[PDB]
Structure 1
Amino acid sequence: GSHMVKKRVLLWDYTNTRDVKWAMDKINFKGPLHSCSNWNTWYPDELKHRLPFRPMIHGKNNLTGGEWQNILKTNEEVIHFFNEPERAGISPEEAAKIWNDQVLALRTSHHKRLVSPSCASDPAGIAWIKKWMNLVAKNPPDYLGLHWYGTKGDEMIRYLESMHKEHPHQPIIVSEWASTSRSYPDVLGLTVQLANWMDSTPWVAEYALFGCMRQMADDFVSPEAQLMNKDGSFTDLMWKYMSDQPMHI
């Protein structure tokens, strides 16, 4: 408690880049926001370098050609591997072979830091990352990527504690999380709890709250958790995430 804690990621869906570039300029760059990701290899120009950007090798499409050239040429420091590879048909054995064969070079040759694939928090996700981490143990990632979605603050905390215990050798990046509660009071309550918690957990490197986009991503996420309105203005939850440390109700 001597310094504003800055470990909040701006998740910047490509539909923002498509429709409301101007909303990036309404971002508070002075608060606890310290990075930005967009699930892609390409850079969102409207950011204008106002935060570090983590490119992602999302899936198999992003391993060759121009997608790969975007990764090879990036001035940014930290690169994410696959999004939810267990749900895209990608085997731990294969993502292992890809890591050793092509992604390691981004460290050993480009001195980038690399996030593990970010798996869902369900048993299929937990067993995917468990096996992959085992296979690449001789060349491990800099960071363990995790997704968490649900209604109970105390449950996300137990999942992070659990996963930290199971994969002790590196810090955690929560590359996506949110409240799925439809009660705005519960959404705010959990977000506050987990932002403030993760802020004082030294082994949590950074955390990335989902929902800064004009339309609902799917039926699983809560309309009450949205960080942007349909006109591309920011919601109060977004104001607080990007302005308040500690954050409060």
Structure 2
Amino acid sequence: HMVKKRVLLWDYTNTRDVKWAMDKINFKGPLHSCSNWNTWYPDELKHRLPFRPMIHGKNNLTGGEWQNILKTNEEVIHFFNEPERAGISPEEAAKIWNDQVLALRTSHHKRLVSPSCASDPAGIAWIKKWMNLVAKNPPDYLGLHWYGTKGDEMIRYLESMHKEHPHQPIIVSEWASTSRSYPDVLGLTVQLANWMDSTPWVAEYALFGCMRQMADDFVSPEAQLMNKDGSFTDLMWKYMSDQPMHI
């Protein structure tokens, strides 16, 4: 039986410059869903994967951005992206969650992923307090990011967050090796892909790096899933073609 819980992170820069790249995807592999950090739909997907709209920040709560969220036929919707690094307090996000985001479950019967905070103390403390404030109306999924070089350390973090918040499944909305050594990137990617596949309470995980330009200095050139011409790397090929993954 083919395990399929691998999210295709499709950065909006792909939609802008290299639409045609989406047709070079392998859809007969472990690829399961798609997301693009936005409310709007990447048309080049042509509904070949379930799409998860995201309410990225306070700028996607009004106008056309909110209409995109209200009118979607897609089943699962993400809340804020790393709100702790954008001046959104747990008090704030909780009061938005109750007043407008809740309606998407109670009325439109959508499943809601929590805000995906970073795996640093500030992020862990932010989700801890938010989940507590909205405990009477909890999210359907716990959203996590993880970045580092030690695969054994990502596992303990997921095991640690599953222990702290045991009442729903986990989605890893972003993750990658930050290692500048490719064998250590390939090594980590392959380890956790195979590990998360056979962990029942991990619903889906989303490998970062599918975009032409480097997102920032923090992430690794060796962990890129798309070359500068829009073609796919070997890491991307294996990510979307191989289950189990292999080095």
In the TM superposition, residue 74 of structure 1 has moved relative to its aligned partner by: 0.2
In the TM superposition, residue 163 of structure 1 has moved relative to its aligned partner by: 0.3
In the TM superposition, residue 129 of structure 1 has moved relative to its aligned partner by: 0.1
In the TM superposition, residue 144 of structure 1 has moved relative to its aligned partner by: 0.3
Give CA deviations for 1:176-227 in whole Å, capped at 9, x if unaligned: 0000001000000000000000000000000000000001000000000000
SS in 2 for 1:125: helix
Give CA deviations for 1:93-116 in whole Å, capped at 9, x if unaligned: 010000000000000000000000
TM-score normalized with structure 1 length? 0.99
Residue 225 (str. 1) matches residue 223 (str. 2): yes
Structure 2: distance between partners of 1:207 and 1:102: 27
In the TM superposition, residue 135 of structure 1 has moved relative to its aligned partner by: 0.3
> Structure 1 vs Structure 2: percent identity of aligned residues?
100
Structure 1: distance between partners of 2:124 and 2:154: 14
In the TM superposition, residue 246 of structure 1 has moved relative to its aligned partner by: 0.2
In the TM superposition, residue 28 of structure 1 has moved relative to its aligned partner by: 0.4
Structure 1: distance between partners of 2:89 and 2:151: 31
SS in 2 for 1:121: coil
Give CA deviations for 1:8-43 in whole Å, capped at 9, x if unaligned: 000000000010000000000000000000000000
Give CA deviations for 1:136-164 in whole Å, capped at 9, x if unaligned: 00000000000000000000000000000
SS in 2 for 1:227: coil
Structure 2: distance between partners of 1:77 and 1:30: 21
Structure 2: distance between partners of 1:191 and 1:77: 28
In the TM superposition, residue 244 of structure 1 has moved relative to its aligned partner by: 0.3
Q: Which residue, out of 90, 97, 100, partners 1:102?
A: 100
SS in 2 for 1:53: coil
Runs of at least 5 residues in structure 1 that lack an aligned partner in the other structure = none
Question: What is the aligned residue count?
Answer: 247
TM-score normalized with structure 2 length? 1.00
SS in 1 for 2:217: coil
Structure 2: distance between partners of 1:89 and 1:27: 37
Structure 2: distance between partners of 1:170 and 1:52: 20
In the TM superposition, residue 230 of structure 1 has moved relative to its aligned partner by: 0.2
* Residue in structure 1 matched with residue 117 of structure 2 by the alignment: 119
Structure 2: distance between partners of 1:244 and 1:17: 25
Structure 2: distance between partners of 1:33 and 1:112: 21
Structure 2: distance between partners of 1:158 and 1:11: 24
Write out the 4+ residue segments of structure 1 that deviate beyond 3 Å after TM superposition: none
CA RMSD after TM alignment: 0.3
SS in 1 for 2:70: helix
Runs of at least 5 residues in structure 2 that lack an aligned partner in the other structure = none
Structure 1: distance between partners of 2:156 and 2:201: 14
In the TM superposition, residue 232 of structure 1 has moved relative to its aligned partner by: 0.3
Q: What are the residue-to-residue correspondences of 1:171-182 with 2, within 5 Å? A: 171-182=169-180
Residue 213 (str. 1) matches residue 193 (str. 2): no
* Residue in structure 1 matched with residue 186 of structure 2 by the alignment: 188
